[PDB]
Amino acid sequence: RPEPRLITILFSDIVGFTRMSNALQSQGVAELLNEYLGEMTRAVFENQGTVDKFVGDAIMALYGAPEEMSPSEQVRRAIATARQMLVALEKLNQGWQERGLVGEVPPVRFRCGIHQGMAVVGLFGSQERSDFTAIGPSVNIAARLQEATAPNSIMVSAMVAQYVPDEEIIKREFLELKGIDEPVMTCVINPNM
Amino acid sequence: MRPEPRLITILFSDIVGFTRMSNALQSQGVAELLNEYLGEMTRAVFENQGTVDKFVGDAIMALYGAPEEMSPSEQVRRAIATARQMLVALEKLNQGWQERGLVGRVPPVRFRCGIHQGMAVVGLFGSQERSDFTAIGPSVNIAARLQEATAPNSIMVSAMVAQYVPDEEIIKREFLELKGIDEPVMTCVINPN
Ligand SMILES: Nc1ncnc2c1ncn2[C@@H]1O[C@H](COP(=O)(O)CP(=O)(O)OP(=O)(O)O)[C@@H](O)[C@H]1O
Ligand SMILES: Nc1ncnc2c1ncn2[C@@H]1O[C@H](COP(=O)(O)CP(=O)(O)OP(=O)(O)O)[C@@H](O)[C@H]1O
Ligand SMILES: [Ca+2]
Ligand SMILES: [Ca+2]
Ligand SMILES: [Mg+2]
Ligand SMILES: [Mg+2]
Numbered sequence A: 001r002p003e004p005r006l007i008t009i010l011f012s013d014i015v016g017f018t019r020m021s022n023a024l025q026s027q028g029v030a031e032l033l034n035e036y037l038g039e040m041t042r043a044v045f046e047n048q049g050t051v052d053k054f055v056g057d058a059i060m061a062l063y064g065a066p067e068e069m070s071p072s073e074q075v076r077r078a079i080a081t082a083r084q085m086l087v088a089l090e091k092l093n094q095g096w097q098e099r100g101l102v103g104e105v106p107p108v109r110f111r112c113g114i115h116q117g118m119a120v121v122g123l124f125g126s127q128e129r130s131d132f133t134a135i136g137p138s139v140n141i142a143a144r145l146q147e148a149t150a151p152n153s154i155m156v157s158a159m160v161a162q163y164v165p166d167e168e169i170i171k172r173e174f175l176e177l178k179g180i181d182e183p184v185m186t187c188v189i190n191p192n193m
Numbered sequence B: 001m002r003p004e005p006r007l008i009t010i011l012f013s014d015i016v017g018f019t020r021m022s023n024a025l026q027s028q029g030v031a032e033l034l035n036e037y038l039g040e041m042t043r044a045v046f047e048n049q050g051t052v053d054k055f056v057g058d059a060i061m062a063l064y065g066a067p068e069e070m071s072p073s074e075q076v077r078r079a080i081a082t083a084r085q086m087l088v089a090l091e092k093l094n095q096g097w098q099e100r101g102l103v104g105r106v107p108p109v110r111f112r113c114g115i116h117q118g119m120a121v122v123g124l125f126g127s128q129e130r131s132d133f134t135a136i137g138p139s140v141n142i143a144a145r146l147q148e149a150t151a152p153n154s155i156m157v158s159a160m161v162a163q164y165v166p167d168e169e170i171i172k173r174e175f176l177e178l179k180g181i182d183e184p185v186m187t188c189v190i191n192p193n
Helices: A025-046 A071-097 A137-148 B018-046 B072-099 B138-149
Strands: A003-014 A050-055 A058-063 A110-125 A130-135 A153-157 A169-175 A184-189 B007-015 B051-056 B059-064 B111-119 B121-126 B131-136 B155-158 B170-176 B185-190
Touching: A003 A071, A003 A137, A003 B018, A025 A050, A025 A058, A025 A071, A025 B121, A025 B131, A050 A130, A050 B051, A050 B131, A058 A071, A071 A110, A071 A153, A110 A137, A110 B018, A130 A137, A130 B018, A130 B051, A137 A153, A137 A184, A137 B018, B007 B018, B007 B072, B007 B138, B018 B051, B018 B059, B018 B072, B051 B131, B059 B072, B072 B111, B072 B155, B111 B138, B131 B138, B138 B155, B138 B185
Parallel strands: A110 A153, B111 B155
Antiparallel strands: A003 A058, A003 A110, A050 A058, A110 A130, A153 A184, A169 A184, B007 B059, B007 B111, B051 B059, B121 B131, B155 B185, B170 B185
């Protein structure tokens, strides 16, 4: 049965994928995407994370579920992952650049949002089709954060930022998010430790 | 499956204001309702030869014409028939949740549906460790966005899908802005019966 517990959600999403989605065609789109994702999942698994699901060119990773994890660990790994994924993106662009797969098309950039809160975690769906995911306001914030941030940046919430030295806090500022009544305190963190 | 272009029809159903009622349902109250909702809704997709791509929270994504082949007219027809059965099935669930005191006497559960037909790269995307079957491209977004813009408990479709729908069944045609698409798109509100 799905039950509530504290977890950290991370969303990674490629910017403007739809554009290059043309003039790159089938093979191009499949080959690039499959590779992009190969690295990103690698980044998640290495940081003890869990790949909840892919949503188009987006990734949804969890920390703290299904395997119990300490609040500090949850955020520390999630951030390590976000910083790691970025390092892969710069190199993949270096791999696709000398392949022509990039360039009437720019390199690939992603938006990342991280949050920590409660969520009803467990198997959702029917007895014919059910997947393991996290449901709840907390998830929506993680998603909304990722969407509100600038390309090639990591935007966490205050809940997350508290485990982050203010020195690594590039930009603090409230922001109204879609579907969230109370304005959230967002924190754009530094890509480097 | 080896990713490749293919004409398909995409269906998105999303519950209206789910985050709002999750605060009056409590963890156990959300899992009960959400899982019951998914069972009846996916049953509808399956009994219309549709394929449940995935669940994006309280939202459902169904594909018609993939993996198994299906004609352009049948895709539209099954996808629409599915959306109409969902409403008939939701009406029943609302009665149940009515007695249970879960909702009704918290407004009764409602959902939005979006359907577009068009080319899209379908197949398995991901890594060797984790990869899933799904559709990718401009076509999927259009449906996702049409869902997003339609009034609660209404079925919105693109003009291409509308091209295979008897005229009297149309309720409202209109040039709208699809929060995610650059140029205005023509939309058609389908009669729920
Ligand atoms: N395979 C898939 N499964 C489910 N939803 C999908 C999907 N592919 C796309 N979508 C949904 O379609 C909508 C638009 O997709 P996006 O990937 O955000 C367009 P984009 O070209 O990448 O621009 P953007 O991400 O910079 O905004 C989103 O709501 C996304 O979640
Ligand atoms: N389990 C999950 N997996 C992936 N994305 C999820 C998710 N739960 C929520 N989201 C994402 O969080 C965002 C908002 O969730 P919503 O479905 O809109 C809650 P809502 O209160 O019902 O808003 P609504 O009334 O506009 O439908 C979406 O982009 C959705 O894809
Ligand atoms: Ca994207
Ligand atoms: Ca919803
Ligand atoms: Mg996006
Ligand atoms: Mg929504």
